[PDB]
Amino acid sequence: RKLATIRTAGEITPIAGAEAIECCHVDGWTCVIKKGEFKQGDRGVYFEIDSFIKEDNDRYPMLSKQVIDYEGQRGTRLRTARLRGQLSQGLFLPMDRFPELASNQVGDDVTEILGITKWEPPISTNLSGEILGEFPTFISKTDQERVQNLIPQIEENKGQKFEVTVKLDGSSMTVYRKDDHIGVCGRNWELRETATNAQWHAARRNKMIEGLQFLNRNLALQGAIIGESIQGNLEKLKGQDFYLFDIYDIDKAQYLTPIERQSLVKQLNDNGFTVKHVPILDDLELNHTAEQILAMADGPSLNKNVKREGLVFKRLDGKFSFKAISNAYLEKHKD
Ligand SMILES: Nc1ncnc2c1ncn2[C@@H]1O[C@H](COP(=O)(O)OP(=O)(O)OP(=O)(O)O)[C@@H](O)[C@H]1O
Ligand SMILES: [Mn+2]
């Protein structure tokens, strides 16, 4: 994930309350900047929310009063914030503050060169087992790009049609089969079945192991586990359950399209395998800007009386996929 990249200043607009600052559009994001830091069309380094930036008075003095400890080192975590009434996200700095990047090009990922890293909520301790092996290379990891970083693609996909589903807030979990072996994995490892492992227990109680055996194909069930003991259980659940959102065809190396997934989950439940699916909302004919898509992010969740974290969109061909995280949710939750 490109936590710090080189980007272009979009349109700049005043903020009436405090004229020492102004509102700057970096592609889909809005920043508060110092007035006269950028004119539109200038390049700079933009750090995304969740960046953790080590303490530097020369380079990041504007971060000096939100310094925290994190996993041993001292630095600043970027979150959604409301600065003098203006909702602002990330940090945009001009290039004359980065001499060692003087001849980098727009679009470059300078995460590693600046030592940026990602602040992460601590381990949910009921969800970490013993590791049989790494995540299998013949399976794609579950990762969604943010719509604020895709404005060119949204204009390209004008006219395309997308499946819209609720984005649950839980940890990712993969159950798969390759020919005589059925494995359970979290985000980055394949785990051994214990009387401990939350993922194995989710897999066994909805029987997706015999289900995958039954279906007799090299498929990867990918879902979020959510519920008790998981990210504050904002969905008011009893227990923990598996909610699917993608199926990776291992042999063809590509995800199932929505209707294929939809009919395969149907096939699974028909034969008595209790695989739940992330909530599907009605499909979308993309004719939108990033702002309008974000504007759909707020709304009812799996529990219809709680505000969802956001939405994810899947182009029906199955090859284009992005999320749009609710900013109201991000503001009503700082961790
Ligand atoms: N409806 C959904 N469709 C796809 N993924 C979903 C859905 N609901 C929840 N998820 C979760 O979304 C996550 C994948 O998105 P993402 O790549 O943003 O996660 P991340 O790598 O943990 O976060 P980030 O990279 O943005 O810091 C997975 O952890 C998966 O469990
Ligand atoms: Mn990711």
What is the CB neighbour count within 10 angstroms for residue 62?
A: 11
DSSP for 286-297, written as a single string = ----HHHHHHTT
143 alpha carbon – ligand 1 mean position (Å): 5
Question: What is the three-state SS of 41-91?
Answer: CCEEEEECCCEEEECCCCCCHHHHHHEEEECCEEEEECCCEEECCEEECCE
Q: Which helix (H) or strand (E) holds 298?
A: none
142 alpha carbon – ligand 1 mean position (Å): 6
Q: How many CA atoms lie within 13 A of 123 on its CB side?
A: 8
Taking Cα atoms as reference points, which of 76, 75, 9 lies closest to residue 42?
9
What's 103's DSSP letter?
A: T
Cβ–Cβ < 8 Å for 248, 260: no
- Alpha-carbon dihedral 86, 91, 96, 100, rounded to 10 degrees: 180
Protein residue with its CA nearest to atom 13 in ligand 1: 143
Q: How many CA atoms lie within 13 A of 33 on its CB side?
A: 26
Residue 230 in tokens: 């998981």
What's 278's DSSP letter?
A: P
Distances (CA, A) of 111 to 96, 115, 117: 18, 6, 7
232-258 per-residue burial string, b: 16 or more CB within 10 A, e: under 16: ebbbeeeebbbbbbbbbbbeeeebbbb
Beta bridge pairs of residue 27: none
Beta bridge pairs of residue 181: 178
Strands 117-118 and 51-54: antiparallel
Instruction: Report d(CA 26, CA 317) in Å as an integer.
Output: 29
Instruction: Report d(CA 78, CA 116) in Å as an integer.
Output: 11
- C-alpha torsion sign, points 150, 278, 134, 318: negative
Pocket, ligand 1, Cβ cutoff 6 A:
1, 50, 142-144, 165-168, 170, 172, 224, 245, 278, 312, 323
Residue 229 in tokens: 């003991």
Distances (CA, A) of 226 to 169, 187, 188, 197: 7, 14, 18, 14
Residue 282 in tokens: 């009605």
Instruction: Report d(CA 238, CA 204) in Å as an integer.
Output: 17
Resolution of this PDB entry, in A? 2.5
Instruction: Report d(CA 251, CA 124) in Å as an integer.
Output: 33
Instruction: Report d(CA 305, CA 24) in Å as an integer.
Output: 35
Atom of ligand 1 nearest to the CA of 118: 27
**In the chain, what are the domain boundaries?**
3-121, 122-142+170-278, 143-169+279-335
CA angle 292–293–299, rounded 5-degree value? 105
145 alpha carbon – ligand 2 mean position (Å): 7
Residue 65 in tokens: 């009063």
**Which ligand places an atom closest to the C-alpha of 322?**
1
Torsions phi, psi for 322 (to 5 deg): -150, 155
CA 321 to chain centre: 11
**Which ligand places an atom closest to the C-alpha of 149?**
1
151-185 per-residue burial string, b: 16 or more CB within 10 A, e: under 16: eeebeebeebebbbbbbbbbbbbbbbbeeeebbbb
324 alpha carbon – ligand 1 mean position (Å): 11
Protein residue with its CA nearest to atom 29 in ligand 1: 172
Identify residues whose C-beta is under 5 A from ligand 2, the ion: 143
Cβ–Cβ < 8 Å for 133, 190: yes
Protein residue with its CA nearest to atom 6 in ligand 1: 167
222 alpha carbon – ligand 2 mean position (Å): 14
Tokens 């029906």, residue located: 316
Q: How many CA atoms lie within 13 A of 306 on its CB side?
A: 15
Taking Cα atoms as reference points, which of 238, 217, 219, 216 lies closest to residue 229?
238
CA angle 325–330–331, rounded 5-degree value? 145
Alpha-helix residue ranges (DSSP H) falling in 32-166: 151-156
Instruction: Report d(CA 255, CA 257) in Å as an integer.
Output: 6
Protein residue with its CA nearest to atom 7 in ligand 1: 167
Cβ–Cβ < 8 Å for 191, 185: yes
Helix (H, G, I), strand (E, B) or coil at 274: coil
Beta-carbon contacts of residue 61 (< 8 Å; ≥ 6 apart): none
Structure determination method = X-ray
Helix (H, G, I), strand (E, B) or coil at 212: helix
Cβ–Cβ < 8 Å for 80, 89: yes
Helix (H, G, I), strand (E, B) or coil at 149: helix
Alpha-helix residue ranges (DSSP H) falling in the chain: 151-156, 198-205, 208-215, 258-270, 290-295, 327-331
Cβ–Cβ < 8 Å for 206, 275: yes
144 alpha carbon – ligand 1 mean position (Å): 6
Taking Cα atoms as reference points, which of 290, 319, 284, 324 lies closest to residue 159?
284
What is the CB neighbour count within 10 angstroms for residue 27?
A: 16
Cβ–Cβ < 8 Å for 4, 46: yes
